[PDB]
């Protein structure tokens, strides 16, 4: 494949920007402060450093916030005492017990293809780039960045059949955040489309929209509907559209996944940035 050969040649480094910011958290940091720091710094994921281990043990992302929130929400009347007073490691101990998952990483000199493969290989969205002489984490490689790069160099959806179209995880307008978070946990998918009284799609609650709870300090109430939640702030595609023009749509709007819908604006499936880079590997 022409795309696959081009990715096999380009070094990760070529995608690292001129001057970037990196936020690293010591595992002994109180996990609440940890999420609050993501919001304040304007970052979606951060590497973790165990001082006793003297190495990067993992990554702290929004899924971790979703996970805690769901595993530990009791009600709006009580504090998530757990979240409020728990360290990153105290929770990493709980979250990953007899089930163990090491740190996944790439080298700047390592291939772009090698990196794209590593994301699907370990089923992740954030990849830390580490230089082996320094051991220093330099950048966090994301699907959105790799795709914007491939699309920068690029000079039907029903025929190629790309994306997930069967047993699609979605919520209603009325659905509480807690319920929705529980879905993100059981299904393990980036976003959930919001459907009306009819199967038609009105909005979309993303793994992202879950940070506003951290940001606005509103996580203490998860009984609130998904629409109530999304009030702080739609994009669709059809099966009768070319992949080149559909890839073009995702990067021009800088969206992590597009909705495959019918004429009556009723859900048919979803085509993630994930699936795209895979089909091109």
């Amino acid at each position: 494949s022409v795309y696959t050969t081009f990715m096999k040649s380009h070094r990760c480094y070529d995608l690292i920007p001129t001057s970037s910011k990196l936020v690293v958290f010591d595992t002994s940091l109180q996990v609440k402060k940890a999420f609050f720091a993501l919001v304040t710094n304007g970052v979606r994921a951060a590497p973790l450093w165990d001082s006793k281990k003297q190495s990067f043990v993992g990554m702290l992302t929004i899924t971790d916030f979703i996970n805690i929130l769901h595993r530990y929400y009791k009600s709006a009347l009580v504090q998530i005492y757990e979240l409020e007073e728990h360290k990153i490691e105290t929770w990493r101990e709980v979250y990953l017990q007899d089930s163990f998952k090491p740190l996944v990483c790439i080298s700047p000199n390592a291939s772009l293809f090698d990196a794209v493969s590593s994301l699907i290989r370990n089923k992740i969205h954030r990849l830390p780039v580490i230089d082996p002489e320094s051991g220093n984490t330099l950048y966090i490689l994301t699907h959105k960045r790799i795709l914007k790069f491939l699309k920068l160099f690029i000079t039907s959806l029903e025929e190629l059949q790309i994306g997930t179209y069967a047993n699609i995880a979605m919520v209603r307008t009325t659905t509480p955040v807690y319920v929705a978070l529980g879905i993100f946990v059981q299904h393990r998918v980036s976003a959930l489309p919001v459907v009306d009284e009819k199967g038609r799609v009105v909005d979309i609650y993303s793994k992202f929209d879950v940070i506003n709870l951290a940001a606005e300090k509103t996580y203490n109430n998860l009984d609130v509907s998904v629409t109530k939640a999304l009030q702080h702030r739609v994009l669709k595609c059809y099966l009768h559209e070319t992949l080149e023009a559909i890839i073009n749509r995702l990067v021009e709007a800088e969206v992590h996944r597009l909705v495959v819908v019918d004429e009556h604006d009723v859900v048919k499936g979803i085509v993630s940035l994930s699936d795209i880079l895979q089909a091109l590997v």
């Binding site: 690293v24 450093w49 320094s134 220093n136």
Partner: protein, 362 residues
């Protein structure tokens, strides 16, 4: 009976540079002329400039800019070191300006662009030629500028300032005459501004027989702008001759200035630092040493304010270095700066620093 080096017959002494005589060389056959800097090994070892020259050669041997004198080859002998370089008939730009008057807006602009391009090349190569003057700007038969004495030049290393107070006091930056610390290019800009004034006016902007008032003027950044001077270039000089390096024109801001841009040829071109304590400097340094050993960290005392400390990693079993330096901020306060020394590196550096801070003054 002709004295030769390479196949060039050593002729007349063109001048005496920073570290040695400069003589003409006319090729045995072709008649080609070269500029030959003679560095006596025994003398370059007397002044402890042996390292300086090693670096100077290294840099200049890989540089290739049209407005910087080319270093053809360096010939070593048991006795002396011969730097074969490009010869230019025109000689000092200084004498040009002495002989002829000041240059016309058009002619001056050309030569300023030419000079600045080279100055830029240097910087773009971590080299900062301090001592930049009309006396070190040479001209060829076609009136093209040529930067020449890299004896006072220095390197720019990530995280360090230079101290040496180099060059003629007329062209010397206020911070250089002040003997304060500097990054490097700002002091080359301050000189280039003086060069620009000299081209346009044919005199020096800061100049007096009374040396203390020459210095007052420099630190007061005050110079006279003659009535013939174009307000746009006056503007450029006002920006280039700032006493504050933080407020001074950058090689980019000059490039962007409309006077410069005109007919310009294509060929050219809530955070806190460290910890701040109000104690007596001697107490501060004693406190750092009594805390560094309180962490079992190996160190070397450079200055009574510079300290090079090393730490053994208890896990990865790897050495990690850092440099500690005290500066005077206020007339009332001081601050301990932490610099990382290159051989996770960055994280281990932070940990190293952190430990100290928790047991230290603001």
């Amino acid at each position: 009976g002709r004295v030769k080096i390479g196949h060039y017959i050593l002729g007349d002494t063109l001048g005496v540079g920073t570290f040695g005589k400069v003589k003409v060389g006319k090729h045995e056959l072709t008649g080609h002329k070269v500029a030959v800097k003679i560095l006596n090994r025994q003398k370059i070892r007397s002044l402890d400039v042996v390292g300086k020259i090693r670096r100077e050669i290294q840099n200049l041997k890989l540089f290739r800019h049209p407005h910087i004198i080319k270093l053809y080859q360096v010939i070593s002998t048991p006795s002396d070191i011969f730097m074969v370089m490009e010869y230019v008939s025109g000689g000092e730009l200084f004498d040009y300006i002495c002989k002829n008057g000041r240059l016309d807006e058009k002619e001056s602009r050309r030569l300023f662009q030419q000079i600045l391009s080279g100055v830029d090349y240097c910087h773009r190569h971590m080299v900062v030629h301090r001592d930049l003057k009309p006396e070190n700007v040479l001209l060829d038969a076609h009136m093209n500028a040529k930067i020449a004495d890299f004896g006072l030049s220095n390197m720019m290393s990530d995280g360090e300032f230079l101290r040496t107070s180099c060059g003629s006091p007329n062209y010397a930056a206020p911070e250089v005459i002040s003997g304060r610390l500097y990054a490097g290019p700002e002091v080359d800009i301050w000189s280039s501004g003086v060069i620009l004034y000299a081209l346009l006016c044919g005199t020096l902007p800061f100049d007096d027989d009374h040396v203390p008032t020459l210095f007052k003027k420099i630190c007061d950044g005050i110079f006279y702008t003659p009535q013939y001077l174009n307000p746009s270039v006056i503007s450029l000089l006002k920006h280039m001759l700032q006493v504050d390096p933080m407020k001074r024109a950058t090689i980019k801001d000059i490039r962007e200035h409309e006077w410069f841009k005109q007919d310009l040829p294509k060929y050219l071109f809530k955070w806190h630092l460290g910890i701040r304590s109000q104690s007596r400097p001697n107490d501060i340094m004693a406190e750092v040493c009594r805390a560094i050993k309180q962490l079992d960290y190996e160190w070397k005392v450079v200055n009574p304010y510079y300290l090079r400390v090393r730490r053994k990693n208890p896990v990865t079993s790897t050495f990690s270095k850092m440099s500690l330096q005290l500066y005077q901020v206020d007339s009332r306060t001081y601050l301990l700066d932490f610099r990382s020394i290159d051989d996770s590196h960055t994280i281990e550096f932070f940990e190293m620093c952190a430990n100290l801070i928790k047991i230290l003054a603001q």
